[PDB]
Design a protein around this ligand. Structure first.
Ligand SMILES: CCCCCCCCCCCCCCCCCC(=O)OC[C@H](COP(=O)([O-])OCC(O)COP(=O)([O-])OC[C@@H](COC(=O)CCCCCCCCCCCCCCCCC)OC(=O)CCCCCCCCCCCCCCCCC)OC(=O)CCCCCCCCCCCCCCCCC
Ligand SMILES: CCCCCCCCCCCCCCCCCC(=O)OC[C@H](COP(=O)([O-])OCC[N+](C)(C)C)OC(=O)CCCCCCCCCCCCCCCCC
Ligand SMILES: CCCCCCCCCCCCCCCCCC(=O)OC[C@H](COP(=O)([O-])OCC[N+](C)(C)C)OC(=O)CCCCCCCCCCCCCCCCC
Ligand SMILES: CCCCCCCCCCCCCCCCCC(=O)OC[C@H](COP(=O)([O-])OCC[N+](C)(C)C)OC(=O)CCCCCCCCCCCCCCCCC
Ligand SMILES: CCCCCCCCCCCCCCCCCC(=O)OC[C@H](COP(=O)(O)OCCN)OC(=O)CCCCCCCCCCCCCCCCC
Ligand SMILES: CCCCCCCCCCCCCCCCCC(=O)OC[C@H](COP(=O)(O)OCCN)OC(=O)CCCCCCCCCCCCCCCCC
Ligand SMILES: CCCCCCCCCCCCCCCCCC(=O)OC[C@H](COP(=O)(O)OCCN)OC(=O)CCCCCCCCCCCCCCCCC
Ligand SMILES: CCCCCCCCCCCCCCCCCC(=O)OC[C@H](COP(=O)(O)OCCN)OC(=O)CCCCCCCCCCCCCCCCC
Ligand SMILES: CCCCCCCCCCCCCCCCCC(=O)OC[C@H](COP(=O)(O)OCCN)OC(=O)CCCCCCCCCCCCCCCCC
Lengths: 96, 169, 98, 114, 104, 105, 318, 70, 347, 80
């Protein structure tokens, strides 16, 4: 009985994973536009905050490379409120 | 305040270490190490080490500190200045470090330390339908073959060694 | 670097200076030794989870297993010392001065 | 070092797929059957460029073909799809295995009318 | 978060029960009552150490329900049976060298 | 006495946990996979002496990926200047940095 | 709204612990050819209330304690662990749905021996400490087979998730593929909660339970109700683990009725075991663990590792 | 006779029935008449946070179907 | 002890040493040190008297503290390098902590305070294992991490070890403490030349292990643990006095013997790097080692101390001890200086 | 060997069941015909994303669409 039913559970797991795979291009496109939205917002507010500061390059990379670096949590949610910070950075861990 | 939860648990962790390391008695030192192990487990749990934190509770506090309290109960007797003085010494050193790294967002004792909440350094992506921590621990059986061999050999030898040196002959 | 690493390393040094300054009991020394192990466990775990370094997730478990077997060895040494001298005092272990 | 180059907020404007995850998971098999080519162009561009700034046009083509997919569902089979994603949506794990008759009705209407 | 709220609630209810059970029987003023190392066993310490070492072997065994999902199944099954066999060999050496005696 | 028995016999006893850029279970990338791969493929074969002075940029990018010291220092500078401008009243925070804009997806 | 759910977990736990004393005294009455309480309430229903009010206004006994702090913390820890063992229990929905509920319960039950150890420290008698160390060695002995039986069963589940264990048993009770694990599980949980025939503290084979001994002990009601919370919890956990019921996701009350009836039958089975056998001697239950249960548990652990591989029945992770 | 134990068993059974029935009704009240979303894995949490962002009311359990697209 | 269990435990000691010597991962280095200590603890408690329990407890505390400092150095390395290869260390704090941990494992001064106590507390065979085989694995790790070893730290440890191991043996009459302070001085000699040429470090370690194995094997074959019990050897086996004479003259660094070879090669490789004061002070400090060696030769071979009457009964019995490789080790510890360019096989 | 087996089954049947269950667990997966399918099912479970290939011109076995005939199939798993 456990043989038949765990084989059925594996086939159901494959069906769930194929649904996930079929949705991953759309979610990746939305995630890319999401992070570029948040980085552009942080860049514009860095341009309007860091005017009085002498010798400040706005949008200066901390890396010598010109390769795209995956953004950090503090790079995205740095200027936002503490509730959005907590819901993005401890939300899955603190979920139930 | 709530974005600093791992930091506040780490302050409780250092306070517990100053507690038992000032050594009042092995009974209360065991109690302080139990409370310290619990809050350091909470530190691990707030990064996503759920299995490793339950390894802290189940193995560290669950077996080993139970054996420490057991062996203490067979070696101490049930019924100071230096302990309380060293306690408040370590507490003042820790709170002065907290005050510096909070008012300055920067300190340097041995290394340079940020003063913001350690939420900043996390990843912004998902792991899909697994835990990366669980799959890396699960790879002890497919990738950690030599590691399993030397760990099991050390534990078997450890059983042999404890039966040798407690035999008295 | 990150703020929690300061507290975990300072916890290691607090349990170090506890372990490097005995009062009377060998059990309190072993408690400081396993507090050193506990701080090493937490520090390695925070690095490995922060880095998403997948295969080193089994590293703190191997650390925990080896050092708890080490702790069992130390408790058996303390037990043999206590069956020799009646207590676990480190001032009873002074026969090897001469 | 150098200045990071980001696209403007005009270049990040697209008509989003503002549906829920059970609506997507209910439609996911036909979405993977029908919206294959822009999705795989995007994922190939995404694993080769290793940069989401070189993949924004393929992301917009994905986000456009998904909308064409759901409009083509909405013109023919809105009610079996709605019943089916409501049944998917009840479950906390969103099981496919709890919803086989609504899946059968949605697949029947989708195979007939599309 | 909800876990922390639940732990705080269980700790609070437990502390409230303990505080009631110590202070509620102090309401009735009672007649103030005025009338009026432990031996070591090696086997008690040895059963605790045997527990600790087999518990570490169990700590090695705990990632098995995740380890069966691997693509290197022959190596995984070999090392799984090898850890359970080394636990059994530790038990056999504990058996045959009189270690499980008078607490058998 | 590094008796390199592993390279002699061809066995892989511990090279798999050695770096982050190695083969991982289910192909999970480390968060600094590219930086470590660049530093290793730079420093490969040329020895430690040439690697410390010729691959310095790749190793600095990789250390700053790992520890994120320059990133946190930059965010500290921006956040301190932001809080000074808020206290001086010369700056207002936008609605998209206060939770008032109905987020993207 | 969540605190309402926490309280409707933890207050009916205490009420069920209250009436388990009545169910115990009645069912042990009728098995002993007598009645249980029927005078204090109608059919004895006021006996837990009267007995609790009696215990809460009774004097702290005679003596003083060696350590005040552990004398306070041992009932706090006992009740706190006895209440936190219930929050991942899927009945059909856990209060705290976690991915590692099994390992959580195993770890929090491993933490429960500190109450016994600290109550042995907090007593002044050096003989009560010896009895506490015997009890600690018993409980940590049977935690080994708890861990390994639990691992062997979870190899058919796929994860440490307790809610998945309802899905695993949708075609058959899990006692059918794992009845030797189930019976060694049941006897090992019996030996966990210091329950007869393994109750050496509350009985003889004990150096300190010997009539006009010393040892200031805690208020008995708190450790007693922690122990009965643990008894009902380990029987609910055995019910989830081996006798998992039918769950309709649109009617959760069917699963709640079904697991409740099975958990009541299994707790009455604890009551019916304690009224049927004499007690083990201490080395006899050490024998029963170390020479009898642990070899079969390691052999069946090898069997339940290698068996989904040879039958192609490896359960999914998710 | 032996049916005298059934009132105590019945009271204890009602006391065990209350927690599970309670958490099922509270999960259906707090989540729009449906089961509580189970997010054990970070993909499930990602989809759940996406639902919370697309619902427009900061609630994941407000489902948006084909009426939300043109 | 069961001979099967003895053989398995010695194979586990050797296994921990080999795991340190072959592995490319820091966790396996730490695992090898843990396995090594865990297996050598019963060898120290072979006879079950309170001095062996005290010696094993002191050894446990020192090697446990060093293993935890080693893991802290490894963890700081994982911070500042993101990897685990056993090579140079990418932080001076990790390098300092690892050099301290290996200095504690070797018993170099000022972490030397366990070595004469632990060596006195244990038998001669376990003292032989402690002073020869237990030096192999930390010198292998120091051989591998030397691009990051601080020079001032390792030379401070080296000269302090040579000086304290010189002055420590001058007050001793117990043979095991003399060998332990000899160990401290020779470990100073090994680590002084490490950053200059580690091939000469391996040469010093090999010649040291040969000579110390010769002295412990002679002390086992004569069953002598004190100076004054070694003094009766002329009336029991006069060839043994000759062998301990030439081996103590070798360990003092006198030509034409092979104990002159390591210190002459160390001075030879330290003057190349424009260090003159330091090998000269090291060479002059080794005269203290030669002084208490000559004290032992005076008490054993060059004079005849008074014996007792019961030695006449021991005249009637031969040595039935397995004096394993004692002629081979005696020849290699004395007559190897004409083969001094054999050291290139360790390059 | 038949006298010893009945004697150890009379004196220590727990150990006989222990060694029998352990010996079956060792030697049985190498004799079972379904041990192949465990490997086949674990390597067919799609955890990651099937990152597509750039169509260079000569890949006749790789499909262009998931519903194309060529490619790896799981009909053995649907049927068994
Ligand atoms: C290569 C590295 C080799 C390292 C040494 C290996 C042997 C020692 C380790 C094991 C051990 O202790 O064995 C006992 C050990 C004898 O040491 P012992 O306990 O002092 O016994 C002394 C009496 O001679 C015991 O006498 P006995 O009456 O009991 O019986 C006589 C015995 C009987 O002989 C046999 O039984 C041998 C035949 C069977 C062999 C095994 C077959 C399996 O013959 C001998 O012992 C003759 C002396 C053999 C030479 C011993 C030293 C070997 C050379 C070491 C390296 C020197 C390098 C110098 C470099 C200089 C420049 C740097 O070895 C033997 O019994 C056999 C030696 C074989 C040498 C082979 C060399 C080439 C290998 C390639
Ligand atoms: C919720 C779980 C169950 C909890 C317990 C049940 C609820 C009831 C709790 C209160 C019980 C009654 C009060 C405490 C018991 C008093 C008994 C007694 O002997 O009192 C004499 C004592 C002392 O009486 P006394 O002055 O005559 O002292 C007699 C003793 N000599 C003479 C030797 C000194 O009464 C009190 O102290 C009065 C206490 C308060 C009275 C009730 C107020 C409201 C309480 C709510
Ligand atoms: C005692 C020896 C027990 C292990 C026997 C071999 C088990 C096995 O499958 O090993 C293959 C495994 C793994 O081989 P593999 O074939 O799975 O490798 C494929 C590559 N990976 C791991 C990335 C999927 O181990 C090795 O090949 C090397 C490690 C062990 C080497 C032998 C140690 C002997 C110890 C003696 C002391
Ligand atoms: C989950 C719901 C409940 C589950 C069932 C439990 C309800 C019944 C409870 C009854 C009351 C029990 C009270 C406590 C009793 C404690 C004493 C006791 O029983 O000790 C156990 C006794 C102890 O032995 P003993 O003391 O009786 O015998 C003497 C022992 N020596 C010789 C060592 C001195 O037996 C066991 O340990 C058995 C454990 C479980 C056995 C599982 C059998 C598996 C068989 C597989 C096949 C075997 C055939 C051969 C191989 C074939 C391969 C194909
Ligand atoms: C500068 C170097 C030291 C840095 C830390 C200083 C902490 C304050 C203690 C100073 C020394 C006090 C002292 O005398 O300690 C000795 C004591 C053991 O002595 P004891 O047996 O208790 O009493 C007999 C008196 N000799 O030993 C102890 O009490 C050991 C307690 C150590 C616990 C350290 C706690 C943290 C300290 C700050 C961080 C480091
Ligand atoms: C989840 C379910 C949990 C269930 C928990 C409770 C289980 C048991 C349920 C109750 C069963 C019946 C109880 C009857 C008790 C006795 C009532 C009574 O009449 O007692 C008589 C006594 C004296 O009366 P007197 O005036 O002297 O009469 C002389 C007549 N000429 O009169 C008195 O003493 C005064 C009246 C006392 C009445 C007490 C009734 C029981 C109270 C129990 C507390 C809990 C209540 C329920 C809470 C949960 C549900 C909301
Ligand atoms: C003598 C002192 C007083 C004694 C009485 C009181 C203390 C003893 C009883 C309390 C014990 C507390 C145990 C709490 C942690 C248990 C492990 C855990 O968090 O597991 C639940 C879950 C793991 O499941 P998973 O689904 O993987 O993670 C969520 C991601 N979806 O993970 C989560 O849900 C993570 C949630 C966030 C992290 C929670 C951290 C809790 C707070 C820190 C520890 C508090 C306890 C410290 C003291 C312990 C005992 C000394
Ligand atoms: C880069 C370097 C890589 C590695 C290169 C190789 C390094 C070699 C290091 C050698 C260390 C040897 C340590 C001692 C041997 C270990 C086992 C042992 O203890 O054997 C002695 C044995 C024990 O018997 P037992 O009865 O317990 O002793 C009491 C006396 N009845 O029996 C006795 O006690 C009997 C008395 C005689 C014992 C003599 C043993 C001599 C062994 C060493 C030979 C010399 C080393 C090899 C050649 C040089 C290599 C560099
Ligand atoms: C090959 C597969 C893998 C095998 C390894 C895995 C094993 C899993 C089970 C773990 C067992 C752990 C404990 C083992 C201890 C063995 C030693 C032992 O118990 O010997 C003592 C015993 C007599 O018992 P006694 O000492 O008197 O006990 C006190 C009460 N009288 O002596 C005896 O009763 C005799 C014991 C030896 C003979 C047992 C024969 C059993 C045969 C079963 C069928 C064949 C199974 C295949 C394995 C080969 C067996 C020869």
């Amino acid at each position: 009985s456990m043989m038949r039913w765990n084989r059925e559970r594996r086939r159901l797991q494959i069906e769930d994973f194929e649904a996930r795979i079929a949705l991953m291009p759309l979610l990746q496109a939305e995630k890319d536009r999401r992070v570029l939205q948040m980085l552009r917002e942080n860049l514009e507010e860095e341009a309007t905050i860091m005017k009085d500061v002498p010798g400040w390059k706005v949008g200066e990379s901390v890396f010598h490379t010109t390769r795209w670096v995956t953004p950090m949590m503090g790079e995205l949610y740095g200027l936002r409120t503490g509730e959005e910070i907590l819901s993005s950075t401890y939300g899955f861990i603190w979920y139930t | 305040m709530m974005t600093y939860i791992v930091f506040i648990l780490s302050i409780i962790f250092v306070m517990g270490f100053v507690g038992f390391s000032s050594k009042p008695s092995p009974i209360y030192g065991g109690l302080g190490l139990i409370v310290s192990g619990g809050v350091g487990c909470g530190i691990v749990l707030n990064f996503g080490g759920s299995f490793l934190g339950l390894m802290v509770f189940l193995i560290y506090l669950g077996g080993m500190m139970v054996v420490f309290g057991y062996t203490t109960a067979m070696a101490t007797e049930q019924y100071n200045k230096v302990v309380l003085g060293t306690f408040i010494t370590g507490l003042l050193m820790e709170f002065l470090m907290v005050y510096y790294v909070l008012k300055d967002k920067e300190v340097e004792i041995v290394f340079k330390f940020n003063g913001m909440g350690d939420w900043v350094i996390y990843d912004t992506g998902d792991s899909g339908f697994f835990s990366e921590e669980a799959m890396g621990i699960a790879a002890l059986y497919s990738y950690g073959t030599w590691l399993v061999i030397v760990t099991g050999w050390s534990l078997l030898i450890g059983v042999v060694v404890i039966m040798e040196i407690t035999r008295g002959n | 670097m990150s703020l929690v690493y300061m507290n975990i390393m300072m916890a290691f040094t607090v349990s170090l200076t506890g372990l490097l300054m005995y009062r009377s009991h060998l059990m309190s020394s072993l408690l400081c030794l396993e507090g050193m192990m506990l701080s090493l466990f937490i520090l390695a775990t925070l690095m490995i989870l922060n880095s998403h370094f997948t295969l080193a997730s089994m590293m703190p478990i191997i650390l925990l297993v080896f050092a708890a077997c080490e702790a069992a060895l130390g408790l058996s040494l303390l037990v043999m010392v206590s069956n020799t001298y009646g207590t676990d005092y480190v001032q009873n272990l002074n026969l090897l001065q001469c | 070092p150098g200045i990071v180059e980001l696209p403007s907020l005009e270049d990040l404007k697209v008509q989003e797929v503002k549906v829920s995850s059970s609506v997507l998971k209910a439609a996911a098999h036909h979405y993977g059957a029908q919206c294959d080519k822009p999705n795989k162009e995007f994922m190939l561009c995404r694993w080769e460029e290793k940069d989401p700034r070189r993949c924004l046009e393929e992301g917009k083509l994905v986000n456009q073909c998904a909308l064409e997919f759901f409009r083509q569902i909405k013109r023919h089979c809105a009610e079996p799809f709605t019943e089916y994603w409501t049944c998917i949506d009840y479950s906390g794990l969103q099981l496919f295995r709890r919803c086989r008759k609504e899946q059968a009705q949605f697949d029947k209407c989708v195979l007939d009318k599309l | 978060m909800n876990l922390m709220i639940t732990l705080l609630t269980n700790f609070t209810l437990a502390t409230l029960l303990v505080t009631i059970a110590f202070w509620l029987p102090q309401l009735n003023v009672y007649s103030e009552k005025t009338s009026p190392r432990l031996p070591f066993s090696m086997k008690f310490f040895l059963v605790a150490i045997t527990f600790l070492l087999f518990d570490l072997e169990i700590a090695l065994l705990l990632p098995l329900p995740w380890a069966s999902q691997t693509t290197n199944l022959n190596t995984m099954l070999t090392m799984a049976l090898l850890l359970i066999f080394l636990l059994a060999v530790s038990l056999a050496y504990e058996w045959t060298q009189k270690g499980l005696e008078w607490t058998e | 006495p590094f008796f390199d028995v592993q390279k002699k016999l061809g066995v892989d006893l511990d090279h798999w946990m050695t770096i982050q850029s190695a083969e991982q279970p289910h192909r999970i990338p480390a968060r600094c996979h590219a930086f470590e791969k660049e530093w290793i493929e730079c420093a490969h074969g040329i020895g430690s002496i040439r690697a410390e002075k010729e691959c310095k940029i790749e190793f600095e990018d990789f250390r700053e990926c790992l520890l994120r010291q320059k990133t946190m220092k930059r965010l500290n500078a921006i956040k301190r200047q932001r809080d000074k401008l808020i206290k001086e009243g010369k700056y207002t925070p936008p609605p998209h940095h206060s939770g008032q804009e109905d987020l993207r997806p | 709204m969540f605190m309402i759910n926490v309280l409707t977990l933890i207050i009916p736990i205490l009420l069920a612990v209250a009436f388990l004393t009545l169910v115990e005294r009645k069912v042990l009455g009728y098995m002993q050819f007598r009645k249980g309480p029927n005078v204090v309430g109608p059919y004895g229903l006021l006996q837990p209330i009267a007995d609790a009010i009696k215990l809460f206004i009774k004097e702290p006994l005679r003596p003083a304690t060696s350590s005040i702090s552990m004398f306070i913390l041992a009932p706090i820890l006992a009740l706190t662990l006895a209440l936190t063992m219930w929050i991942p229990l899927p009945m059909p929905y856990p209060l705290i749905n976690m991915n590692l509920g099994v390992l959580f319960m195993l770890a929090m039950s491993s933490l429960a021996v500190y109450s016994i150890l600290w109550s042995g420290w907090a007593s002044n008698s050096k003989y009560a400490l010896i009895g506490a160390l015997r009890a600690v060695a018993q409980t940590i002995s049977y935690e080994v087979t708890l861990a390994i039986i639990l691992l062997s069963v979870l190899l058919m589940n796929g994860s440490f998730t307790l809610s998945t264990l309802i899905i695993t048993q949708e075609q058959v009770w899990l006692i059918f593929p794992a009845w030797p694990l189930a019976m060694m599980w049941f006897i090992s949980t019996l030996a966990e909660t210091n329950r007869a025939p393994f109750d050496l503290t509350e009985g003889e084979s004990e150096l300190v339970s010997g009539f006009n001994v010393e040892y200031a002990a805690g208020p008995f009601a708190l450790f007693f109700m922690a122990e009965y919370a643990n008894i009902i919890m380990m029987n609910i956990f055995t019910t989830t683990l081996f006798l998992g019921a039918f769950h309709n996701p649109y009617m959760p009350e069917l699963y709640t009725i079904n697991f409740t009836i099975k958990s009541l039958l299994l707790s009455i089975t604890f009551l019916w075991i304690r009224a049927s056998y004499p007690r083990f001697r201490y080395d006899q239950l050490m024998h029963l663990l170390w020479k009898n249960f642990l070899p079969l548990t390691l052999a069946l652990c090898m069997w339940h590792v290698s068996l989904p591989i040879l039958l192609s029945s490896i359960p999914p992770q998710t | 006779m032996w049916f005298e134990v059934l009132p105590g068993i019945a009271v204890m059974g009602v006391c065990l029935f209350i927690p599970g029935m309670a958490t099922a009704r509270i999960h259906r009240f707090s989540n729009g008449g449906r089961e509580k979303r189970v997010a054990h894995y970070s993909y499930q949490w990602y989809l759940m946070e996406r639902d919370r962002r697309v619902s427009g009311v900061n609630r994941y359990y407000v489902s948006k179907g084909l009426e939300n697209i043109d | 002890m069961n001979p099967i269990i003895l053989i398995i435990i010695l194979m586990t000691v050797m296994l921990g040493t080999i795991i340190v010597m072959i592995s490319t991962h820091w966790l396996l280095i730490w695992i090898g040190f843990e396995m090594n200590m865990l297996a050598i603890i019963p060898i120290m408690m072979k006879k079950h008297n309170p001095r062996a329990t005290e010696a094993s407890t002191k050894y446990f505390l020192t090697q446990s503290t060093a293993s935890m400092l080693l893991m802290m150095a490894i963890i700081i390395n994982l911070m500042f390098s993101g990897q685990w290869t056993v090579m140079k260390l990418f932080n001076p704090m990790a390098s300092m902590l690892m050099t301290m941990a290996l200095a504690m494992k070797l018993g170099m001064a000022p972490f030397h305070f366990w070595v004469p106590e632990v060596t006195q507390g244990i038998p001669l065979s376990s003292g032989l294992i402690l002073l020869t085989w237990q030096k192999l694995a930390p010198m292998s790790v120091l051989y591998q991490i030397l691009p990051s070893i601080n020079l001032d730290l390792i030379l401070t440890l080296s000269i302090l070890s040579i000086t304290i191991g010189g002055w420590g043996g001058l007050n001793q009459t117990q043979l095991r403490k003399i060998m332990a302070y000899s160990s401290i001085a020779h470990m100073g000699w090994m680590t002084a030349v490490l950053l200059y040429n580690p091939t000469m470090t391996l040469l010093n370690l090999i010649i040291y292990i040969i000579m110390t194995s010769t002295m412990f094997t002679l002390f086992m074959a004569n069953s002598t643990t004190t100076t004054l019990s070694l003094s009766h050897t002329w009336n029991k086996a006069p060839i043994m006095t000759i062998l301990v004479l030439i081996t103590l003259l070798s360990m003092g660094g006198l030509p034409p013997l092979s104990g002159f070879m390591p210190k002459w090669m160390i001075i030879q490789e330290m003057t190349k790097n424009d260090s003159i004061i330091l090998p000269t002070l090291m060479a002059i400090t080794a005269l203290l080692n030669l002084y208490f060696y000559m004290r032992l030769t005076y008490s054993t071979a060059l004079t005849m101390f008074p014996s007792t009457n019961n030695m006449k009964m021991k005249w009637q019995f031969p040595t039935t001890k397995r004096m394993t490789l004692l002629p081979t080790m005696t020849v290699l510890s004395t007559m190897l200086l004409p083969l001094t360019p054999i050291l290139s096989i360790l390059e | 060997v038949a006298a010893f087996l009945k004697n150890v089954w009379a004196k220590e049947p727990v150990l006989v069941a222990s060694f029998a269950i352990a010996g079956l667990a060792v030697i049985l997966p190498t004799l079972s015909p379904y041990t192949k399918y465990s490997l086949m099912i674990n390597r067919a479970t799609p955890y990651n994303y099937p990152v597509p290939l750039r169509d260079d011109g000569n890949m006749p076995d790789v499909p262009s669409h998931p519903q194309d005939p060529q490619g790896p199939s799981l009909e053995w798993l649907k049927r068994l």
